A paper describes a structure:
Systemic AL amyloidosis is a rare disease that is caused by the misfolding of immunoglobulin light chains (LCs). Potential drivers of amyloid formation in this disease are post-translational modifications (PTMs) and the mutational changes that are inserted into the LCs by somatic hypermutation. Here we present the cryo electron microscopy (cryo-EM) structure of an ex vivo λ1-AL amyloid fibril whose deposits disrupt the ordered cardiomyocyte structure in the heart. The fibril protein contains six mutational changes compared to the germ line and three PTMs (disulfide bond, N-glycosylation and pyroglutamylation).
3D reconstruction of the fibril images yielded a 3D map of the dominant morphology with a resolution of 3.1 Å, while the remaining minor morphologies could not be reconstructed. The rise and twist of the reconstructed fibril are 4.76 Å and −1.46°, the pitch is 117 nm. The fibril consists of a single protofilament (C1 symmetry). The handedness of the fibrils in this sample was determined by platinum side-shadowing, which showed a left-handed twist. The ordered core of the fibril consists of two segments that extend from Ser9 to Thr52 and Ser68 to Thr108. For residues Gln1–Pro8, Asp53–Lys67, and Val109–Ser118, which are present in the fibril as shown by mass spectrometry (MS) (see below), no well-defined density could be discerned in our map, suggesting that they are structurally disordered. The fibril protein fold is defined by buried electrostatic interactions, such as between Glu84 and Lys46, and by several buried patches of hydrophobic residues, such as the one formed by residues Val10, Ala12, Val34, and Trp36. The fibril quaternary structure is stabilized by an interlocking of the protomers in the direction of the z-axis that is caused by a 14-Å height change of the fibril protein backbone. The carbohydrate can be seen as extra density within our 3D map that could not be assigned to the polypeptide chain (red star).
Residue numbers in the entry:
A (entry chain F), B (entry chain G), C (entry chain E), D (entry chain D), E (entry chain C), F (entry chain B), ...: 9 to 52, 68 to 108
The structure:
């Protein structure tokens, strides 16, 4: 006879990509419970200006902040075929 | 005889892509319960200006902030075929 | 007879990619429970300007901050085919 | 008869890629519980300017800070085919 | 009869890639519990400027700081085909 | 009869890649518990400028600091095909 | 009858790659517990400038500091095909 009485008080605060918390696998027989690996198989005239949290062609996880991002300017981007006198 | 009495007080606050919290798999026999891996198989004259949280061609997760983003300007983007005198 | 009475008070704060916390595998027989490895199989005229947390072609994890990011400028990006007099 | 009464008060603060904390594997027989290795199999005219936490083609983990990042400028990126008089 | 009464008060603060903390493997028979090795099998005209925590083509772990990063400038990146008079 | 009453008050502060802390393997029979070796099998006209904590093609561990990184400049990177008069 | 009552007050502060602390292997029979060796099998016109903690193609461990890194400059990197008058 198997008996379980789990109690999990979980608090997740400002944690984006969290995974597999507070899980209870109770049984009389169990093969490969909780199988959650993280496998990664990585095979391998423009004037641009970028500011802030940016992704271009990624497969990456959650990008965030918990707080304040203060005033940003990006003041002046004079590029291709431009002429000033 | 299997007996379970789970109790999970879960609190998720400002956590975007969270996954697999507070799950209870109770049985007399169980094969591969809770299978949730994260597999990634990655095979491989314009004047632009960008400000803020930006994604262009990604397959990435939730991008966010919990707080304040203050005044931003992007004041002045004079590019292609432009003429000033 | 197997008996378990787990109690887990978990607190995750400002921790993005956390994984496999507070999990309870109770049984009378169990093969390979909790299988969660991290396997990585890595096989191998533009003027650009970038500011901030940036990913271009990655398969990387959550990028974040818990605090304040103060005023940034990126003031002046004069590149391709530009002329000034 | 197997008996277990675990109690884990866990606190994770500003720790991104944490893994396998507070896990309880209770049974009468158990083969290879908690299998979570970290295997890595690594086989092997533009003017650019970058500031901040950056990833380009990586498969790396969570990059973050817990604190303040102060004002940054990236003031002046005059590159390809540019002319000034 | 096996009896266990673990109690683990764990605190992880500003520790990114931590692993395998506070885990309890209780049983009457157990083969290779807690198998978590770290195996690494490593087989082997642009003007660039970079500032900050940067990864280009790595498979490395979490890169972070717990504190303050003060104002950085990257003021002046005049490279490919540039002309000044 | 095996009896165990572990108690581990663990504190990890500013320690990134820590591993295998506070783990309790209790049983009546156990083969190769706690197998966690670290095996490493290592087989073997651009003007660049880099500042800060940087990885290019590594499989290395967590790189971080716990404190303050003060103002850095990288002021002046004039390289490929550049002309000044 | 085997009896154990371990108590480990562990404190790890500013120690990155620490391993195998405060682990308790209690049983009536145990073969090769705590097997964690560190095996290493090592078989064997650009102007560059680098500042800070840097890894290029390594499989090395956590690189960090616990303190302050003061203002660094990298002021002036004039290399490939450059001309000044």
């Amino acid at each position: 006879s198997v008996s379980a009485a789990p109690g999990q008080n979980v608090t997740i605060s400002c944690s984006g990509s969290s995974s597999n918390i507070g899980n209870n696998y109770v049984s009389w027989y169990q093969q490969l419970p909780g199988t959650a690996p993280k496998l990664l198989i990585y095979e391998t005239s423009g004037t641009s200006a970028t500011l802030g949290i940016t992704g271009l062609q990624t497969a990456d996880e959650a990008d965030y902040y918990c707080g304040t991002w203060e005033s940003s300017l990006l003041a002046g981007v004079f590029g291709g075929g431009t002429k000033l006198t």
